[PDB]
Curated annotation (Swiss-Prot), chain A:
Outcome recorded upon mutating residue 46 to T: In OZEMA14; uncertain significance
Complete-protein stretch covered: 166 to 476 of 499
WD repeat intervals: 17-56, 59-98, 101-138, 142-181, 188-230, 232-273, 276-311
Pathway(s): Protein modification; protein ubiquitination
Lineage start: Eukaryota, Metazoa, Chordata, Craniata, Vertebrata
Record's protein name: Cell division cycle protein 20 homolog
GO molecular function list: anaphase-promoting complex binding; histone deacetylase binding; ubiquitin ligase activator activity; ubiquitin-like ligase-substrate adaptor activity
Clinical disorder: Oocyte/zygote/embryo maturation arrest 14: An autosomal recessive female infertility disorder characterized by oocyte maturation arrest, fertilization failure, and/or early embryonic arrest.
UniProt record similarity statement: Belongs to the WD repeat CDC20/Fizzy family.
Keyword match Phosphoprotein: yes
Length: 311, 6
């Protein structure tokens, strides 16, 4: 199939933090990209090109460490270096909450309806019920180093977390009568696991990717614990996304090519490589229609690739 | 350098 070798757009990302563990971009269901540039968050409306500086941190030294849109796209969660999880209403352009519970920077976030899960450099994961005063409703402690990857499954039955301790944990949706204990703990990656993504059409299928010392994409069945595939990408794997229409996966990489790789699922055959970034890719996010992937890189650019469409 | 500009 025809995949364009050039991106559809190249947006300037001056002052983007070249820190592997941070999750600095997210594309809303309302077709708005949120991009964290140092101490500010900018919003770019894909349909009009309008840009808004939503917020800026108020104290010296503070920087944005994560962003994540709620499913409806009206609220943006913003994790900070000062261990806060802020909740912004982007229609009103105002901060609704400043949730403190963490002891260190909040580098990862994932929503499950009104529950927002936040992962910290401390190794802990907190569940926040953003609708209520006592927001901190659970603590999940299965990592000894920074939680850099965090993703609820689309059906809300599992939460996956990846850490700088080379572990992947698969958590249940509720503690039940027991405690918050992982259903699965995968130790096979030999490097940090920032890339965590669930298969949109298969409830229990998860893809994870490891850092420079690992370089592999692994596919798992979280019910059986099976590792269905382990593929060497020859570079750190910062992010993985699944196409919800083509039965393909896309991954972002660093040294030496700083490319995105498209893979055919389930064969894991390499379909294409998107080249152009001149420094390592930091994060990927996908448009709500599934057609475009935005890659944020250390070269201070956001490249938007229309790699899953012909129109 | 305007942020997010083309």
């Amino acid at each position: 199939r025809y995949i364009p070798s050039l991106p559809d757009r190249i947006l300037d990302a001056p002052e983007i933090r070249n820190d592997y563990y941070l999750n600095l971009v997210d594309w809303s269901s309302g077709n708005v990209l949120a991009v964290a540039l140092d101490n500010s968050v900018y919003l770019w409306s894909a349909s009009s090109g309008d840009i808004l500086q939503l917020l800026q941190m108020e104290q010296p030294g503070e920087y944005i460490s994560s962003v994540a849109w709620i499913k409806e796209g009206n609220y943006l969660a913003v994790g900070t270096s000062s261990a806060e999880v802020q909740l912004w209403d982007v229609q009103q352009q105002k901060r609704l909450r400043n949730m403190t519970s963490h002891s260190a920077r909040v580098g990862s976030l994932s929503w499950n309806s009104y529950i927002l899960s936040s992962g910290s450099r401390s190794g802990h994961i907190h569940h926040h019920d953003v609708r209520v005063a006592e927001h901190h409703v659970a603590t999940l402690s299965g990592h000894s180093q920074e939680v850099c990857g965090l993703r609820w499954a689309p059906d809300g039955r599992h939460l996956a977390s990846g850490g700088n301790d080379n572990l992947v944990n698969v958590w249940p949706s509720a503690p039940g009568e027991g405690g918050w204990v992982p259903l699965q703990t995968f130790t096979q990656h030999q490097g940090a696991v920032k890339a965590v993504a669930w298969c949109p059409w298969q409830s229990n299928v998860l893809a994870t990717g490891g850092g420079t010392s690992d370089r592999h994409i692994r596919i798992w069945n979280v019910c059986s614990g099976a590792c269905l595939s382990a593929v060497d990408a020859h570079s750190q794997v910062c992010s993985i996304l699944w196409s919800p229409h083509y039965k393909e996966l896309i991954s972002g990489h660093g040294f030496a090519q700083n490319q995105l790789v498209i893979w055919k699922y389930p064969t894991m055959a390499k379909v294409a490589e998107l080249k152009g970034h001149t420094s390592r890719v930091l994060s990927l996010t996908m448009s709500p229609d599934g057609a475009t992937v935005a890659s944020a890189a250390a070269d201070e650019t956001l490249r938007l690739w229309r790699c899953f469409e012909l129109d | 350098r305007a942020p997010x500009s083309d």
